Structure 1
Amino acid sequence: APEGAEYLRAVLRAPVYEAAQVTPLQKMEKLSSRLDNVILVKREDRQPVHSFKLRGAYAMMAGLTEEQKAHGVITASAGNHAQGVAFSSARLGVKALIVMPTATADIKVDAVRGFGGEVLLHGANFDEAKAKAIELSQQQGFTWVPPFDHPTVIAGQGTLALELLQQDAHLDRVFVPVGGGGLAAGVAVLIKQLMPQIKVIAVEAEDSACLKAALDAGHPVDLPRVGLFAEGVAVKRIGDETFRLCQEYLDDIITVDSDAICAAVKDLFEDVRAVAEPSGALALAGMKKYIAQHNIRGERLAHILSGANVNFLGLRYVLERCELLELE
């Protein structure tokens, strides 16, 4: 449980650039002209695993002891965290086992194996895959790699915000997607240590708003049901350490429905020619709603395209909603 000062030094020490790279901060030209603001996208889809999660996973796994590395790492994931851990394991020479639910698509399982990870199909949902991963952790001595709730993982995602401040120090507000809150905690703790004038706003899907629920209650709480449309942010309970940072450093939170998310997927395809996954377009959808609700004009605003690992046939849903939005 470090203070902001220690987090800043951990962000600097995190060796993310042995696996991840500095990603472009690109102006969205069509959307900037339309919304009377300078809107910039942090293109985390350009990482080797096509999401940001490589940063925190590699940071945590490089920081393990020689003993822990020799016994390998385990985790449970539906996709993006699995590719982060598989890729980091190949680079570090460490055995990695990823438990995924039995219903996981072959393309996702293949991607994890292609990056050098061992895959175990187990469980009817993510909760049963995580139970198997923790059980196997204690039984066979694998080290558990948490997808968000860990200071070294938060520091790793914080490298993203450090790049932002050097790529554009005149930023006014940064919009961050939230699942368990690893990324939001890293961005918010880093920015509040270096350039606290910049507003950090968390964005959540309406049917997956576990941080909003935790903020309302004043502590982490379980959601009764989590929507599955945005896979990456389908988290039932915000993390303990991530909530501590988010409750302390976030300036605001906003929620958006499936329609806004799909509109943002279309916006990013037309402005930067990338197909974001729904959780990758989430922060943009929040920013667009924030801009209208608060009548924001003349500012420099950034959102994180956090991932672009999309199911091809799953794009039918996104495109159908976009067609339905045209009819109105």
Structure 2
Amino acid sequence: YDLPVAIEDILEAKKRLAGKIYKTGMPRSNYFSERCKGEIFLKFENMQRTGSFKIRGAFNKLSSLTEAEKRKGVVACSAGNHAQGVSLSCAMLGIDGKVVMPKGAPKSKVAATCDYSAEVVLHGDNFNDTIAKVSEIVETEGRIFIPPYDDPKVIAGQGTIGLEIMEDLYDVDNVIVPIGGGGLIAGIAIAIKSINPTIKVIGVQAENVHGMAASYYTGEITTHRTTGTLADGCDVSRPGNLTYEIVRELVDDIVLVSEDEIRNSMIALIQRNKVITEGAGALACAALLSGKLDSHIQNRKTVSIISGGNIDLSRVSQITG
């Protein structure tokens, strides 16, 4: 009955985002609709600022802070998209931001975050080293940590996508969503379920690593990870506390897609729809082509989220070659 985020938080976020972050395209897809024997629409969060949706939740958090909180500075850790989302937000709001990264994060991602204003700190040869440094920085400098998903405002920001979907297409039947730590689907599901709960919200993760999926099937929080994935944005072994709480209550299903199916989805998106997607941005479309949603999607209206496009063209060519 009681959840840690409500429609009001997403309506508050809408208002903080009003005139700053903007609605992305959601066109009917020719290729996917023919393939899937139903109407497939593609939500372009890859074309949101910074190249992923992460700006939304990050902008809501950072601007819902008090001046007393903004003076404290802020801090995060990421090798890609979250780093970029907080940085643009830190420039936009003029908040002093620092961002920790491992000592081998893509050079394209390492400059993109500096250009966006925030100070990059390269440190350690793994992800847990990054978190070790953040804890030290918060401890010593007194900066506000910006969670990539497990935060009510972050989730609220993300939810603004759900409003956009129903605003553009409110005879939508299905919404298909990628999951890492769980903020995108959490936000989206609250927005959708609060306004039209008969719209089915379906999650997607890689077979290689799916903490949230494992938690969703288990009934409590648990880890799952064997190896990495092409959907690197969703390489998250253990799902968030707030996010799992919401997903278990509101998400109608979570499906798993293989690496080959992620690749096939990337190929179709760039080749047959002309949109640049990274692996995590192709997860939802992977699930459509897999055949695992056919009974949900056939002769119905289905929205597939393109969560990000931060991938080097050479890597696209490698995968879609």
**In 2, Cα distance between equivalents of 1:165 and 1:118:** 38
- Match of 1:49, SS? helix
Asked if structure 1 preserves the Cα contact closer than 8 Å seen for 2:210 and 2:225, the reply is no
**In 2, Cα distance between equivalents of 1:76 and 1:228:** 20
**1:139 counterpart = 2:140:** yes
AA of the residue aligned to 1:314: R
**In 2, Cα distance between equivalents of 1:250 and 1:241:** 14
**In 2, Cα distance between equivalents of 1:130 and 1:195:** 38
Asked if structure 1 preserves the Cα contact closer than 8 Å seen for 2:103 and 2:123, the reply is yes
**In 2, Cα distance between equivalents of 1:108 and 1:317:** 18
Q: Which runs of 5+ in 1 are unaligned?
A: 321-328
Q: Partner of 2:189 in structure 1?
A: 188
**In 2, Cα distance between equivalents of 1:279 and 1:122:** 25
**In 2, Cα distance between equivalents of 1:66 and 1:122:** 29
**In 2, Cα distance between equivalents of 1:153 and 1:311:** 27
Give 1:297 deviation, angstroms: 1.9
Matches within 5 A, 1:5-154: 7-14=6-13, 15-154=16-155
Q: Partner of 2:306 in structure 1?
A: 305
**In 2, Cα distance between equivalents of 1:196 and 1:110:** 42
Asked if structure 2 preserves the Cα contact closer than 8 Å seen for 1:19 and 1:58, the reply is no
Asked if structure 1 preserves the Cα contact closer than 8 Å seen for 2:232 and 2:280, the reply is yes
Give 1:216 deviation, angstroms: 2.6
Report the RMSD for the aligned CA atoms in angstroms.
1.7
CA 142–51 in structure 1, closer or farther in 2 if over 3 Å, else same = same
**1:280 counterpart = 2:278:** no
CA 224–308 in structure 1, closer or farther in 2 if over 3 Å, else same = closer
**In 2, Cα distance between equivalents of 1:54 and 1:295:** 30
Q: Partner of 1:258 in structure 2?
A: 259
User: What per-residue deviation string (whole Å, max 9, x for no partner) do you get for residues 37-89 of structure 1?
Assistant: 11000001111211000000000111112122011110001111111000000
User: What per-residue deviation string (whole Å, max 9, x for no partner) do you get for residues 217-276 of structure 1?
Assistant: 221112344414322101121000000000000001100001111111111113331120
Runs ≥4 residues deviating over 4 A: 290-293
Give 1:318 deviation, angstroms: 1.2
User: What is the TM-score normalised by the length of structure 2?
Assistant: 0.95
Percent of residue pairs bearing the same amino acid type:
36
User: What is the TM-score normalised by the length of structure 1?
Assistant: 0.93
Asked if structure 2 preserves the Cα contact closer than 8 Å seen for 1:19 and 1:88, the reply is no
AA of the residue aligned to 2:313: F
AA of the residue aligned to 1:94: I
**In 2, Cα distance between equivalents of 1:22 and 1:43:** 9
Q: Which runs of 5+ in 2 are unaligned?
A: none
- Match of 1:60, SS? helix
Aligned length: 319
